[PDB]
Design an enzyme around this catalytic site. Structure first.
Site, PDB file in Angstrom:
ATOM      1  N   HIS A 132       0.828  -1.205   0.000  1.00  0.00           N
ATOM      2  CA  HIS A 132       0.000   0.000   0.000  1.00  0.00           C
ATOM      3  C   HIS A 132       0.869   1.265   0.000  1.00  0.00           C
ATOM      4  O   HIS A 132       0.492   2.277   0.594  1.00  0.00           O
ATOM      5  CB  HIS A 132      -0.964   0.024   1.208  1.00  0.00           C
ATOM      6  CG  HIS A 132      -1.962  -1.101   1.228  1.00  0.00           C
ATOM      7  ND1 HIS A 132      -3.280  -0.935   0.848  1.00  0.00           N
ATOM      8  CD2 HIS A 132      -1.840  -2.398   1.603  1.00  0.00           C
ATOM      9  CE1 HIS A 132      -3.923  -2.084   0.984  1.00  0.00           C
ATOM     10  NE2 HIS A 132      -3.072  -2.987   1.442  1.00  0.00           N
ATOM     11  N   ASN A 168      -9.900  -2.843   3.345  1.00  0.00           N
ATOM     12  CA  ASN A 168      -9.729  -2.724   1.883  1.00  0.00           C
ATOM     13  C   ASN A 168     -11.077  -2.435   1.213  1.00  0.00           C
ATOM     14  O   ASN A 168     -12.113  -2.492   1.873  1.00  0.00           O
ATOM     15  CB  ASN A 168      -9.143  -4.009   1.305  1.00  0.00           C
ATOM     16  CG  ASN A 168      -7.631  -4.123   1.505  1.00  0.00           C
ATOM     17  OD1 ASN A 168      -6.938  -3.124   1.720  1.00  0.00           O
ATOM     18  ND2 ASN A 168      -7.119  -5.348   1.438  1.00  0.00           N
ATOM     19  N   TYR A 212       2.217  -5.004  11.833  1.00  0.00           N
ATOM     20  CA  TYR A 212       2.029  -3.565  11.705  1.00  0.00           C
ATOM     21  C   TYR A 212       2.765  -2.788  12.777  1.00  0.00           C
ATOM     22  O   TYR A 212       3.205  -1.672  12.539  1.00  0.00           O
ATOM     23  CB  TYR A 212       0.549  -3.169  11.707  1.00  0.00           C
ATOM     24  CG  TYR A 212      -0.248  -3.523  10.477  1.00  0.00           C
ATOM     25  CD1 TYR A 212      -0.531  -4.847  10.171  1.00  0.00           C
ATOM     26  CD2 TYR A 212      -0.772  -2.527   9.651  1.00  0.00           C
ATOM     27  CE1 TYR A 212      -1.292  -5.182   9.076  1.00  0.00           C
ATOM     28  CE2 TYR A 212      -1.551  -2.857   8.546  1.00  0.00           C
ATOM     29  CZ  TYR A 212      -1.810  -4.187   8.278  1.00  0.00           C
ATOM     30  OH  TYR A 212      -2.576  -4.536   7.195  1.00  0.00           O
TER      31      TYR A 212
HETATM   32  C1  HEM Z   1      -7.696  -8.472   5.636  1.00  0.00           C
HETATM   33  C2  HEM Z   1      -6.406  -8.465   5.263  1.00  0.00           C
HETATM   34  C3  HEM Z   1      -5.620  -7.142   5.062  1.00  0.00           C
HETATM   35  C4  HEM Z   1      -6.086  -5.887   4.891  1.00  0.00           C
HETATM   36  C5  HEM Z   1      -7.553  -5.410   4.805  1.00  0.00           C
HETATM   37  C6  HEM Z   1      -4.935  -5.001   4.768  1.00  0.00           C
HETATM   38  C7  HEM Z   1      -4.982  -3.640   4.578  1.00  0.00           C
HETATM   39  C8  HEM Z   1      -3.897  -2.779   4.592  1.00  0.00           C
HETATM   40  C9  HEM Z   1      -3.950  -1.358   4.325  1.00  0.00           C
HETATM   41  C10 HEM Z   1      -5.231  -0.558   3.976  1.00  0.00           C
HETATM   42  C11 HEM Z   1      -2.712  -0.870   4.437  1.00  0.00           C
HETATM   43  C12 HEM Z   1      -2.314   0.606   4.225  1.00  0.00           C
HETATM   44  C13 HEM Z   1      -2.464   1.408   5.516  1.00  0.00           C
HETATM   45  C14 HEM Z   1      -2.092   2.833   5.199  1.00  0.00           C
HETATM   46  O1  HEM Z   1      -2.828   3.455   4.388  1.00  0.00           O
HETATM   47  O2  HEM Z   1      -1.063   3.324   5.740  1.00  0.00           O
HETATM   48  C15 HEM Z   1      -1.816  -1.957   4.786  1.00  0.00           C
HETATM   49  C16 HEM Z   1      -0.447  -1.887   4.989  1.00  0.00           C
HETATM   50  C17 HEM Z   1       0.349  -2.881   5.535  1.00  0.00           C
HETATM   51  N1  HEM Z   1      -0.031  -4.204   5.716  1.00  0.00           N
HETATM   52 FE1  HEM Z   1      -1.979  -5.000   5.427  1.00  0.00          FE
HETATM   53  N2  HEM Z   1      -3.786  -5.765   4.883  1.00  0.00           N
HETATM   54  C18 HEM Z   1      -4.166  -7.080   5.078  1.00  0.00           C
HETATM   55  C19 HEM Z   1      -3.319  -8.154   5.248  1.00  0.00           C
HETATM   56  C20 HEM Z   1      -2.043  -8.052   5.754  1.00  0.00           C
HETATM   57  C21 HEM Z   1      -1.238  -9.113   6.333  1.00  0.00           C
HETATM   58  C22 HEM Z   1      -1.671 -10.590   6.478  1.00  0.00           C
HETATM   59  C23 HEM Z   1      -0.066  -8.580   6.686  1.00  0.00           C
HETATM   60  C24 HEM Z   1       1.131  -9.262   7.376  1.00  0.00           C
HETATM   61  C25 HEM Z   1       0.931 -10.308   8.183  1.00  0.00           C
HETATM   62  C26 HEM Z   1      -0.102  -7.170   6.366  1.00  0.00           C
HETATM   63  C27 HEM Z   1       0.926  -6.294   6.596  1.00  0.00           C
HETATM   64  C28 HEM Z   1       0.977  -4.962   6.276  1.00  0.00           C
HETATM   65  C29 HEM Z   1       2.119  -4.117   6.512  1.00  0.00           C
HETATM   66  C30 HEM Z   1       3.477  -4.516   7.135  1.00  0.00           C
HETATM   67  C31 HEM Z   1       1.705  -2.740   6.011  1.00  0.00           C
HETATM   68  C32 HEM Z   1       2.572  -1.468   6.039  1.00  0.00           C
HETATM   69  C33 HEM Z   1       2.072  -0.674   7.243  1.00  0.00           C
HETATM   70  C34 HEM Z   1       2.907   0.560   7.396  1.00  0.00           C
HETATM   71  O3  HEM Z   1       4.021   0.612   6.815  1.00  0.00           O
HETATM   72  O4  HEM Z   1       2.445   1.479   8.116  1.00  0.00           O
HETATM   73  N3  HEM Z   1      -1.317  -6.881   5.797  1.00  0.00           N
HETATM   74  N4  HEM Z   1      -2.579  -3.106   4.860  1.00  0.00           N
END
Ligand code: HEM
Ligand code: HEM
EC number: 1.11.1.6
Lengths: 678, 682
Positions: free
Chosen positions: A65, A138, A352
């Site tokens: 993202h 999402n 996160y």
């Molecule tokens: C229902 C499943 C998921 C949804 C709805 C989702 C949604 C999101 C969204 C919207 C962001 C962007 C947040 C922003 O705008 O700063 C994000 C970032 C991120 N996501 Fe997810 N994600 C999912 C699954 C996962 C999984 C399974 C992992 C790891 C186990 C993950 C790890 C991360 C990481 C490390 C970031 C970067 C956050 C940051 O740098 O601040 N995501 N995700």
């Protein structure tokens, strides 16, 4: 003003002299040199403090993202929801809470295009009076995988190939479809990404989802399973792929500019917060496991119940400090909400918090103005890189006689403390497995596909046809067809055509004809056309411009954003043909007199690329937009073989054109212009 | 194999079991849970070590030139140049030195489009036997500003607005043109960026420049002033703006793919290294000051002298480890070369060392495989984050009795040490000023514009028209016109038209009619058509495909990369109409029989967007490409109003079409298809 708390960190430089970062007025337009044509001196402290800051401006982009934009707003509760949750931000009718929301794509790096085909992020922070609560959601209600441990596999496979870093912001390559077919759980989210949800008209025209089942918990510990939904008041709307592609080049900032403009123009977007609420005993009642994030709960089994509304009405002042730095976490939970044993959610909780260490290079990122809660921080944490406070309590431990017991423990009964749902239990052996209740990867993809309109289904098929045709490996393509066949033989067959392969024989194990509401985009007209954009094609010669100006004024009456286009920036002209493209507009209207730039001498101006006006009109039509021409401008429609009788094509007097365009803009896309297999 | 040295850190996972980063075989597809539908356990060390690595994958992009791609290769000296430089890599005929080159844009972030309009980076590392030497150049010979202290100003103004971070990878906004007009030194590089240099056909079709005057220094300390030039053996080539825009959307990876493909296919690109050499006492003899990076030296005054050739023939194995992590520095200098008092170069030396601390979060970035020299490191540096070596010498200071004088001092006469040009002197008061010799900001932009072909000049004007028309602030647009007018009254008039502003009155102070060679792209045809791309538009119906296959095989003989396109991937088809776009090809040819998809039923298919075959042929034609049609397919040309006897249009039998297309590809763009100001007057 949702941004009020941030005013104290705003810095005004107007009317001031330049300074270093440690104070003292300076000049910083010349390096200090040893002689007129001499070398620069190391003692030039001014040069170094200025270049060092510049040199170090960049921070790592989000690992996923990376590409996105956000804004501030206000969430308003419609009620006192204490009967279902202890959550303070939902504790009273009309109670208001500041929010910040960031929307995004997933795969692309910073700078990648808004209109890539992708899943989209929809992350909301509620700055509640009991701490920051984030719903990190999402625009699609299900995710690709069932266990967080598989996230790096998914993401590696979707992101660019690691040898050449190609392709940017796209699933259209071997590794992605290798993964989708090797890991069949992925098929459901894949179908959504291959539908209109993959190429939304704007952030404002998306629904949002928490995806995971969470828990709402009352003061007395009673729990309900919950799905979070954001329902867009602007309506869902999607582009068509061939348009999204051109737009990706013509304006990579299409969605971020759209949001910014809507807010600046006083057309703040809104979403209703809605929940599905089901008893604990329903976890496995609906033919799937509610802990499985690759499934959604059909609204027929549990209707949406609206809790409140959030409106985004303030743009950031500094994108970096606010939008880039904001650090969302699903572990940002508050009293009245709890997690579930969703194995995807479970691992996010770790990820996160940990990732912020990478992005912010230290443990005090919650102290950044955009991350600070409004409710107060009192604990025994100390030090760390960039510690921005000075703690008064010298007895930074518990338990303690010396600090008199402060800061004090809070739990379910004292101090409104967070508490885990009292009834939750664990039973069974420790295991590295998944419940067999997670095994069905095909029924819901079929359910989704079933629930789309015929042309909408064709878009999904054509997206898959486009994507899979980029797969160089023959066996991966066959693997893809074998998996598609388990969802729908018809889908598999129609896709196979494009790949020049033979689809497997029907495998009816998961086939079914059920449908569910609320997943289609194209089956419903828009509730409002406010903010939608009309490109008015004019010309500086003759009386066209004055009429175009009249047309503009009337259209703007209905809340439309109008751009008058001509060969050059004459009075009344908003944009040149050179700078204009159909992708920028929801509607294209040729002003009377402008037919002169569609053929003959008027169409050969060196002021724009050959064919430019005809192309805009051609693109607008083929991409399903309402298109029109006033008076003699109908010759322009004729020049491109388009006929007035067609749906979403308008001609005649100005009054009639305005009326039809405005009604057409509610339909938004005219699907009769897209061929369907057979 | 230029990558030979990297083999020792290559890791092969074929036939192995999965492990943690500390060893031990594992499985890592299931989180450890407390019960069958249970919560994940904190003691799952496997999960956390895997996700921690994932979570921390990203490092900051480069503050400028974040978007780019690179390759390994070899540089070969054409001779023993010890008569002009002590530089070891230039010290013998046929001497070979490994290189790595990264090409880039400037403004855009990672992920932005290759075909944005922008200056382009052309950075080369020579891994010499006397240390790493980098020429950190661009594809344009002059830079925007004359003093390094103004870099953050330029860059801030050109990068997206800081309130909303718009627009990506573009100079087409208020702040950029406010800066260009407020800081007129910028006008020269601006004109180059508004020319074909801003939108090259590929990295392989760019020249390169060190921009600054440097010094070559011989063993005895004698120096000459030098300009570095890279001359593409592929020839310079550029797109048109309307093409580059669609291409940004259709294939953001166009340039990195082009380079990768050329190398994989055994068509490695080459550039000759050439220099201009100037006597020290002639530094200010050529109508400007050679310490001024906003000026180039006309080749009429000092011709290019070729020193050798570099060929890029090895793609990276891991892009991140190699391309993303490589850290260039103009301070990477070697014995035989020295700096000059160019105030822009001066500040770069500081900035590129310092910025590595941000990107690499530590002082040991020179230890990364891609940054290591091949010549050995011996000094008293120790510790620091990520220290990858174990130092044996415990007397890590100099001078010292206990270490017997080692590592030992090296200088001009001992141990072939670096030395500053012995003749260099400083004179005068310490100042925060710039030499008055730097004052002329308009003469060379005029020189450059004069030296382009008429349609080429039109491209520059049209680019300025496009960009400036994005500027919302009226005064800024007027400020821009006032500046353009100081360069050329006709240019300002022609631009003013687009902006709806009054044609300004001549301001002739800097006007002149001088021309210089070597700056035009379009005044010369390509030396080779190897690797150039032909899209053959065919159909699955009838015999078209078979004929398409024959056409393809002949074209491929002449070194062309041919893509046969049809409705779906039948045998012989490389790409579907759905996936195809004219931007991907240098020429477009309709195979006999394919006329059926340009009208009637054949043009109406669920397999591709309405009009797609026609749009491809139309784009190809409008963007100035060689277009063609075999036999009956001439009906396709007729369908889009193209006459069979136009320049760059070929119709006839297979043999003739192949001939004509191959001829047209050398011309590359057919400029007769672009209107010049005045053409439409009656
Ligand atoms: C229902 C499943 C998921 C949804 C709805 C989702 C949604 C999101 C969204 C919207 C962001 C962007 C947040 C922003 O705008 O700063 C994000 C970032 C991120 N996501 Fe997810 N994600 C999912 C699954 C996962 C999984 C399974 C992992 C790891 C186990 C993950 C790890 C991360 C990481 C490390 C970031 C970067 C956050 C940051 O740098 O601040 N995501 N995700
Ligand atoms: C003749 C003028 C200049 C030229 C030809 C030039 C060229 C380049 C190139 C080609 C790169 C990318 C190297 C790569 O591929 O990794 C780069 C990066 C960079 N440049 Fe320049 N540049 C110029 C002026 C400046 C100035 C005046 C400054 C500051 C004083 C500067 C600061 C930087 C920095 C901090 C980077 C990022 C380096 C890194 O992160 O590794 N540049 N420049």
């Amino acid at each position: 003003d949702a941004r009020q708390r941030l005013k104290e960190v705003e810095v005004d430089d107007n009317g001031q002299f330049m300074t270093t970062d440690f104070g003292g007025n300076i000049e910083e337009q010349f390096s200090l040199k040893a002689g007129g044509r001499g070398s620069t001196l190391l003692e030039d402290f001014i040069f170094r403090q200025k270049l060092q800051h510049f040199d170090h401006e960049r921070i790592p982009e989000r690992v996923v993202h990376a590409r996105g934009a956000g804004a501030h707003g206000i969430f308003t509760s419609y009620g006192d929801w204490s009967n279902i949750t202890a959550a303070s931000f939902l504790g009273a009718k009309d109670k208001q809470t500041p929010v910040f929301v960031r929307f995004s794509t997933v795969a692309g790096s910073r700078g990648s295009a808004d209109t890539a085909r992708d899943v989209h992020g929809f992350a909301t922070r509620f700055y509640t009076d009991e701490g920051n609560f984030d719903i990190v959601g999402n625009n699609i209600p299900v995710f690709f995988i069932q266990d967080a441990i598989r996230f790096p596999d998914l993401i590696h496979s979707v992101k660019p190939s690691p040898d050449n870093e190609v392709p940017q912001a796209a699933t259209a390559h071997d590794s992605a479809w290798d993964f989708f077919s090797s890991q069949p759980s992925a098929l459901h989210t894949l179908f959504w990404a291959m539908s209109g949800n993959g190429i939304p008209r704007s952030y404002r025209h998306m629904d949002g989802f928490g995806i995971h089942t969470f828990r709402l918990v009352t003061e007395d510990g009673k729990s309900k399973l919950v799905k979070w939904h954001w329902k867009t008041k602007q309506g869902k709307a999607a582009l068509v792929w061939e348009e999204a592609q051109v737009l990706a080049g013509k304006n990579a900032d299409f969605h971020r500019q759209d949001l910014w403009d809507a807010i600046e123009s006083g057309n703040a977007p809104s979403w209703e917060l809605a929940v599905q609420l089901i008893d604990e005993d329903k976890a496995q009642a609906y033919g799937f496991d509610l802990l499985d994030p690759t499934k959604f709960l059909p609204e027929e089994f549990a209707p949406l119940q609206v809790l409140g509304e959030m409106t985004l009405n303030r743009n950031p002042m500094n994108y970096f400090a606010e939008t880039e730095q904001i650090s969302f976490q699903p572990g940002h939970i508050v009293r009245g909400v709890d997690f579930t044993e969703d194995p995807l959610l479970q691992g996010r909780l770790y990820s996160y918090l940990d990732t912020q260490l990478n992005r912010h290079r230290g443990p005090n990122f919650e102290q950044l103005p955009i991350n600070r809660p409004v409710s107060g921080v009192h604990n025994n944490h100390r030090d760390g890189q960039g510690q921005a406070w000075i703690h008064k309590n010298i007895h930074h431990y518990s338990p303690s006689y010396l600090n008199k017991g402060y800061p004090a423990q809070a739990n379910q009964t004292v101090g409104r403390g967070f508490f885990t749902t009292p009834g939750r239990t664990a039973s069974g052996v420790l295991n590295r497995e998944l419940s067999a209740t997670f095994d069905d990867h095909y029924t819901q993809p079929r359910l989704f596909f079933n629930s789309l309109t015929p042309v909408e289904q064709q878009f999904v098929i054509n997206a898959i046809r486009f994507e899979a045709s980029h797969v160089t490996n023959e066996q991966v393509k066959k693997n893809v067809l074998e998996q598609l066949n388990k969802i729908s033989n018809d889908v598999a067959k129609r896709v196979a055509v494009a790949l020049g392969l033979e689809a497997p024989q029907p495998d009816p194990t998961y086939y079914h004809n059920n449908v569910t509401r609320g997943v289609s985009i194209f089956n419903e007209s828009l509730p409002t056309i406010a903010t939608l954009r009309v490109g008015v094609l004019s010309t500086t010669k003759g009386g066209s411009l004055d009429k175009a100006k009249a047309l503009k004024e009337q259209l703007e009456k209905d809340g439309l954003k109008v751009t008058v286009i001509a060969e050059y920036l004459a009075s009344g002209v908003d944009q040149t043909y050179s700078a204009a493209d159909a992708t920028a507009f929801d509607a294209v209207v040729v002003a009377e007199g402008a037919e002169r730039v569609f053929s003959g001498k008027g169409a050969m101006s060196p002021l724009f690329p050959a064919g430019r006006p005809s192309q805009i009109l051609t693109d607008g039509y083929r991409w399903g937009k309402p298109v029109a021409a006033v008076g003699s401008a109908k010759k322009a429609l004729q020049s491109i073989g388009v006929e007035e009788k067609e749906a979403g094509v308008y001609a005649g007097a100005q009054d009639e054109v305005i009326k039809g365009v405005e009604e057409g803009l509610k339909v938004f896309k005219f699907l009769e212009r897209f061929a369907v297999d057979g």
